[PDB]
Amino acid sequence: KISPQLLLAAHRFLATEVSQFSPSLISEKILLRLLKYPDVIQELKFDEHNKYYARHYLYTRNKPADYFILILQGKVEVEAGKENMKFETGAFSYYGTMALTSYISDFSVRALVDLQYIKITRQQYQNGLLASRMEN
C-alpha cells in the first residue's frame, strides 16, 4: 500500500514539475480527487521466471496508448530509439505526458523490478480539467 506521504509528495511534485497538471490548469483539490479516484494507483508484481511478458510492458512499441503514468516505486527501463537503445530509470519518472492531449507509442516501458505507478487516462484528465473550470 502507498503511504499518504508518498501520495501527497506525488501531488506536489506532479503539480509543480509537470506541465499539464499545473494548479492553474487543474485545481489542487481536483488533482487530489483525480489521484484518489479508483484505479488511478496501480501496483504490478514482477514475475522473475518470465522477465519479458505482455503484462510487464507499461508501454508497447509502436502500439497506441492514451494515458500518462508517473512511477512512484520500483525500477524501470525504456527501450525506445531508432537503434533500440535501453536506459534505466527509477521512481518519479513520468512517461506519456502529451498522450493526454486530444497516440502510437514510440517508447517502450518495461518493468525491471516490482513497481507501483499511477495511471491517468486522457478521459480522466480532460474531465478533471472541466471540473477544475468549476469555481475552485
Author numbering: 545 to 646, 694 to 727
How does the study describe this entry?
The Cyclin and CBS domain divalent metal cation transport mediators (CNNMs) are the most recently identified proteins involved in magnesium cation (Mg2+) transport across the cell membranes. The four known members (CNNM1 to CNNM4) encoded in the human genome are integral membrane proteins with strong homology to CorC, a bacterial magnesium/cobalt efflux protein. Structurally, the CNNMs are complex multidomain proteins that consist of four independent domains connected by linkers of different length. The intracellular region is directly attached by a long α-helix (H0) and comprises two distinct domains, a Bateman module and a cyclic nucleotide monophosphate binding-like domain (cNMP domain).
Our final CNNM4cNMP model was refined to 3.7 Å resolution and shows an overall fold similar to the CNBD domains in, e.g., PKA, cAMP activated exchange proteins, cyclic nucleotide gated (CNG) as well as hyperpolarization activated cyclic nucleotide gated (HCN) channels, and also in proteins containing CNBD homology domains (CNBDH) such as the KCNH voltage-dependent potassium channels. As in these proteins, CNNM4cNMP features a central β-roll surrounded by helical elements at both its N- and the C-terminus. The β-roll contains the so-called phosphate binding cassette (PBC) formed by strand β6, a helix turn (αP), and strand β7. The first striking difference is the unusual length of the loop connecting strands β6 and β7 in the PBC, which is approximately 50 amino acid residues longer than in related proteins. This anomalously long loop, disordered and not visible in our crystal structure, is conserved in the four members of human CNNM family. The second unique feature in CNNM4cNMP is an abrupt turn of the polypeptide chain at residues 601–603 that distorts the otherwise canonical strand β2 and redirects the Y603 side chain towards the interior of the cavity, thus blocking the required space to accommodate a cyclic nucleotide like cAMP or cGMP. An analysis of all interfacing molecules in the CNNM4cNMP crystal structure also suggested homodimeric assemblies, where the intersubunit interface of 617 Å2 is mostly hydrophobic and involves residues E627, M629, F631, Y639, M642, and Y694.
